[PDB]
């Protein structure tokens, strides 16, 4: 999202840009160590969501979120 | 003939049980607007609220900082740190935060917002790091 | 005439198959997923251990 555009910007058009401005607005992949919200439903505790660090397979096989059988006293 | 999407006629059945005279003035009906307050801020000797950021305002305030350096980000820190929510947690625990809390402690009837304003940089931080 | 079957009740042709057909319930499913406010995809999250 270019800020002097006022608008958001394509990676495959910005092959010119060769850095970033400050002020820009970027969208990255979501990586390991950021944090997301688990939920499972029916959410009944205040556990029922929670804050997890994300570890990212890179297994392309894999398309399960993965979990401590430790953690899944959190939502049940 | 046969029509399936019914819409399933929907009811209510407990009924609720809520326990001169001119047309109308420009007063009583209208002013919608409500009367603006005046600001009266609690004396600093006079508070009652705790000194102690709670984790709501704490986490409110490293939030509004981060969002502010993110558009912004001339900073106070002395170390350089990559992201806001970094800086901001790092401007609180330095007790830096240029931010400041008000407790809305009463909105009275005669159009006073009695607050109680709290400065981040003398009170206790409860967060981790 | 009473012979005739033009103006029959097309709603008597549905024999009943239960007793009280005709008393109205007011109370809510006590099996009905009403409250919870859960996906219909998600339904294996509520089945038994």
Known sequence: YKQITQSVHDIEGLKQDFRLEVGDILYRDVVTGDVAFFNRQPSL???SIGVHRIVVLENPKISTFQMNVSACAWYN | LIMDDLVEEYVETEEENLVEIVES???????????????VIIPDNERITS???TTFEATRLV??????????????????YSSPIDIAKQELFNRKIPLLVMRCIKVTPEGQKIVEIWNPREMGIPLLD | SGEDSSMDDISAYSSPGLFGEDIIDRLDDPFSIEDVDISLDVLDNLAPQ
């Open chain 2, 63 to 80: 939030a509004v900082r981060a969002q502010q350096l993110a558009i912004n980000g001339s900073t106070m820190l002395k170390k350089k």
């Open chain 2, 25 to 39: 003035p420009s007063i009583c009906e209208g002013f919608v607007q409500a009367s603006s307050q005046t600001l």
């Open chain 1, 45 to 47: 505790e205040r556990s």
């Open chain 2, 51 to 53: 000194n102690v950021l």
